[PDB]
Assembly symmetry: D2
């Protein structure tokens, strides 16, 4: 049984990690979370230890290591800014890391972790589940058959109620900003499908809307991201729908369904089989997100302006 510890046990995404650890036959040995509604853990791993203090959690896994029972993986589902130091914890404990996205917030942290992987003999992986979504895998094989850059329009609107503005997720120093926190997976999907960003522009940057343009090696991309559910197109909004994804590639919609229940598990599966997404796979989206977070706004040309920008 591969042996896991987990951070962020009380959070929204952690149950998918409990399910994944179970479904690959792993065992959860310990969890860390300063918050304590975590009792769902009893249904999966009735024996797991639990800590509220990071140093106590670390001291415990270090004793496990020192007496031959260390965890193989620290799975990390804490707020975004804690990814890097908790990955650093995984490696100093002689463990591999399996971190929620964004893997870390800064290109400079990716580099530092490259070095520590070397000197530590351990590896850093990340959960990028769009990469295992069967429609998007299908999209990538097709594109492999095609010549020429694609023109892409990417839209993602994901309504959040009021609690969202009271959470770490809108605190730029913890979340990296809207584009990072609700965008990272789409910029990662774009890098995966279309390669490196030669040019990056940001055209709107407010508390509820980020929008802009990328020129990547394989695509020109106009993109729009929002947490305000009224950018949902009116035919779906009159239905009380709260979200809307759409990637169109050369005017054609890319149909990937919501229905998928298993993608965290598939990621965990790939990772254990030595096919996981490492620092090299993750880095380009992080680099773009860091630029998006820090670049001054620019005025878009008409070719370059997302349609929702008007």
């Amino acid at each position: 049984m591969t042996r896991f510890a987990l951070t962020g046990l009380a959070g929204y995404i952690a149950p998918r990690h409990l399910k994944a650890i179970k479904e690959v036959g792993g065992v959860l040995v310990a969890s860390l979370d300063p918050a304590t509604n975590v009792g769902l853990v009893d249904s999966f791993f009735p024996e797991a230890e639990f800590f509220t203090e990071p140093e106590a959690f670390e001291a415990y896994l270090e004793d496990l290591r020192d007496r031959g029972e260390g965890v193989d993986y620290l799975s990390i589902a804490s707020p975004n800014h804690l990814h890097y130091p908790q990955i650093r914890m995984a490696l100093r404990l002689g463990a591999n890391a399996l971190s929620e996205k964004p893997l870390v917030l800064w290109p400079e942290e990716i580099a530092r972790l490259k070095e520590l992987e070397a000197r530590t003999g351990r590896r850093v992986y990340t959960v990028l589940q769009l990469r295992v979504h069967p429609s998007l895998l299908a999209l990538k094989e097709r594109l492999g058959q095609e010549k020429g850059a694609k023109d892409v329009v990417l839209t993602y609107v994901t309504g959040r109620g009021k609690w969202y503005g009271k959470s770490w997720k809108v605190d730029e120093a913890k979340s990296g900003g809207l584009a990072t926190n609700i965008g990272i997976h789409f910029f990662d999907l774009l890098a995966w499908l279309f390669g490196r960003a030669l040019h990056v522009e940001v055209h709107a940057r407010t508390p509820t809307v980020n929008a802009g343009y990328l020129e990547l090696e394989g695509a020109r991309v106009r993109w729009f991201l929002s947490i305000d559910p009224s950018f949902v197109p009116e035919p779906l909004r009159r239905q009380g729908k709260r979200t809307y994804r759409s990637i169109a590639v050369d005017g054609e919609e890319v149909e990937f369904s919501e229905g998928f229940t298993d993608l965290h598990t598939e990621v965990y599966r790939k990772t254990l089989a030595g096919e996981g997404f490492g620092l090299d796979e993750a880095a380009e989206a992080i680099r773009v997100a860091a630029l998006l977070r820090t670049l001054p706004l620019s005025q878009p040309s008409p070719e370059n302006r997302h349609p929702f920008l008007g």
Copy 2:
């Protein structure tokens, strides 16, 4: 359309409150919780306000009240020691209070809420779902048919992993202790079936077990409470059970480990129709738990001793 606010939204029991508010066709106007994994609320009430600061939640509700739009109920699912001051907030805001058990921790607090109900024109109600469990309402019907006090064996085992001992639930000043935080349900069930407690003894009192004997108007009761999954009887531990709740009366036995899904809803239904559990109904279990809190351990006569003790 009854208007609710709710405290402790991120917690373990909150989701059953969100379902009861929906199912009774109320609307959730605002929630408070310093912890912010609360996004499940979007699935129910995508417009509700949200606060992490109680003073700000209170000023918002007060504004609504002052402009004629105040909530009807404050549903309270925060840790036990805050039930009382949040019920006080409820009344001072013009809302009835609908509070998780233990309604409050101390009988002196019960008596203060009685005065205040009078000065504020609103009511304090409590969630005592064992009182609407159909097997127990059934058990109560049979008991009413018979003359004489009954001899009762009450066994309540609810396994918890290590997380429980890092939570407020084991902090006696926040939870009132194991016999309050878990036991109040059964002390209240026994008050409802058998009336007042004439004599109370505690025989064991450790971080994981509490046990003792009560003489109530209608019954003699030996009781055993534990958070150690190991006291679940062997036949049920084999099939993976962590929770065992049984009352045996003269030797007829009812299991009620099961069937709680939407008993919260039913409590909400009764409470809205004016047949809710008020301060008069809740006081006696509260008085008993408070006594069990300060009481010195005593040696049990063998007729007074629960069978899981020896």
Copy 3:
């Protein structure tokens, strides 16, 4: 003997409040703060009650009131975004409020407080110690003696090390931003001296620097505000000084880096003597600070530019 309760006991400013209350012959009945290094309080008011939960602090004060022993004042030293809801608490308890600056973050809040004072017959005061600084009182007396617009240069450097960036003080939602949390002192000084701001520009807004230009009824004002200690005039840096506050107006320069030891007690004295700063006195600086918060940066004309951006 004036009865006080206090919020924010564990913080940087609270010790001036303890001293103020003691020195005007007040007594501290109770305090509130989630944080608990507050033991200094025993050496002022060894019997005061202490709460970490706002709802409990409030129920307690309300009991005191209900039995004819309410506090006379709630002194408020919590983070800036909590001022409004805590003054609302004080008034709903039949106490006056004496709040730290900024009295509140939003002008519209000043208008609700005004209505609550009439209903209540209680008053909301604020701590504006610059208005009692002898150097600034004397400046104001001299300026009284001459008609015509004044030409003003205001420099306010309050050097802060790295800890400041992890504090609520740099979280815009809680502090209002540098120009509010520190700036309000000098925007209020300026309003007090020269009246209403007719025109407002912001030239720099970074994490350590805010600067801009005002035109008020009585004066034009070039201002610069920084928490970077490198901005202290070299001559004074040489000497270990980390804070520099001066106002230069028409051929005279008044320094006010020091002289603050007793100013909080003098504010309490004036307020207890019915000469405190109320909503009317505080509102203009609050209005300007709220404007500065949202205004887009603009290119300064050279004559409108503070010399430190020079």
Copy 4:
């Protein structure tokens, strides 16, 4: 210049650590505390880094050493239950530790630290200022110029208002209980003066009082500890004194109610004369026994007067 990092910067005792570091020529390079009224630090070490997340502080310190700029000491002033894990962080970073009392909460943690010291070549020290108090260094003096068991009465009343009951200091899992959190100083003083405890009893253990009786190699000791100020003897009381610390040894009283001892401790620690695991271990063993022994009824001759 000796390089320190500090934990617990926002708390009650931290300013004595800032003063000590400054006064022995040290430099504070970084601090950790989840709480943020820490601005006092700018008037000592205006350049120090500051962290609220332990993992982030530790990554930073590790970076410092992965490139030759490590701290030499980690000064630890966080709640008691965090001493052990923070000392571990110190040793794992290649730094020595200088931890507030009690050094750790359990005897078994002492043994594990002793192993880590050997693996690492680094050392764990602790702040036991009563050992540097000139009035107790002088009691110890007079003492070792006679043998034979002493008869000792220890009274330690350290008055605290209502805020104390809302603090980690009364949470037994964090503080170890009253006899540990306050008691450890006098249990250590006694072990230092009189050696190992051979017999231990507890006669009262309430939220405000712990009292009992010890027999040590060199003394019998009746002891009483309270955070309730009303146990200050009615003479010193009617005048609003709120702390009283007395050890009477065969009828003669030394009083240590009123205090720079932290600096002396840092000095001796950096001078190679600090208080290590060996020194700290006995008080820790006794405090652990008392947090856990069942109460017992004292014989009259073994019962502290104040009972």
